[PDB]
Design an enzyme around this catalytic site. Structure first.
Site, PDB file in Angstrom:
ATOM      1  CB  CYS A  54       8.058  -1.062  -0.860  1.00 20.99           C
ATOM      2  SG  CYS A  54       9.633   0.939  -0.449  1.00 20.99           S
ATOM      3  N   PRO A  55       5.496  -0.948   1.020  1.00 20.36           N
ATOM      4  CG  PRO A  55       4.612  -3.253   0.815  1.00 20.36           C
ATOM      5  CD  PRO A  55       5.777  -2.236   0.153  1.00 20.36           C
TER       6      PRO A  55
END
Lengths: 182, 183
Positions: A54-55
């Protein structure tokens, strides 16, 4: 050893110059380090777009970008992906692994010159470490944080530390009681 | 320029170092690997006996039990000799000395350590003022560069080690609205 552009000079470490193509507001724009002179710059390298990781940091910087702007600070994220991949990533919904619309620039380091200059390029794997650089309003490097996981709190810590550096910039420092110079 | 800070794998191992330190007034050999299993706060500062107060070192020494309680150790280093470090410790603070101190002072007399850490200044012959936080696995987690003595960098260092340790233990979760693609 390896070579990098992080060269101590004088009594500071100037941030290496960079320029490249970024995606801003869904459009390509040429960006350079000197565009941020007079402001603090949070410069965040991350390995790659479109992975299964996930960013978290980019999303949180984007959500909170007005808080940083309120304290004379901008944020730019960078990976070795091309600007076309950055745009496609922004144009992919988060529920499908995309970044979705974002309010901070994504800078492309396709030819790897920027990450080599910043000493965060991995020669074998062809991408960068995850690394958060804080650069002051004089273009001097003040902090680098290296995380191997996406850490949301690092956005909070960045807001706190920028404010602390700025306070120090303005107020100088005081020595402990009981110490006197020779 | 050249340095020891080489990205490898998916992180940045802290460069190996070894040298002679002053510990409780005695010369002792010290090396990075002595600290395996502990976080290490490794603080470079330009020089002993200057007119710039050694605020960080003094504060780390007074608070050293707080770091030890979270499995963290602190070492300070300059390019001065170990003889200079010992003399500095043996000089009273009111005369510009460091006075008795509870943290090791590492000598980098031949400049190998500061070159490896990328903080050596060739023209002046000493280092920047910089704080490195190295985790229990010997991996570099943070570098902070202050040109002035900043006392609160001790409080900040304590808080950051705590945070790094919390992450080590608990990991991180994704933003609620985000899901990965897949093969």
């Amino acid at each position: 050893h390896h070579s990098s552009g992080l060269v101590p000079r004088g009594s500071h470490m100037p941030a290496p110059y960079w320029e490249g193509t970024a995606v801003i507001n869904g459009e390509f724009k040429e960006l350079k380090l000197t565009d941020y002179r007079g402001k603090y710059l949070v410069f965040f390298f991350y390995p790659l777009d479109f992975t299964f990781v996930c960013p978290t940091e980019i999303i949180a910087f984007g959500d909170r970008i007005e808080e940083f702007k309120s304290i004379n600070t901008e944020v730019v994220a960078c990976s070795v992906d091309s600007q076309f991949t950055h745009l496609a990533w922004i144009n992919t919904p988060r529920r499908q692994g995309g970044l979705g619309p974002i309010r901070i620039p994504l800078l492309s380091d396709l030819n790897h010159q920027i990450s080599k200059d910043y000493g965060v390029y991995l020669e074998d794997s062809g991408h960068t470490l995850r690394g958060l650089f804080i650069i002051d309003d004089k273009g001097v490097l003040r902090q680098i944080t290296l995380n191997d996981l996406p850490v949301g709190r690092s956005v909070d810590e960045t807001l706190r530390l920028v404010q602390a550096f700025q306070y120090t910039d303005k107020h100088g420092e005081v020595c402990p009681a009981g110490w006197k110079p020779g």
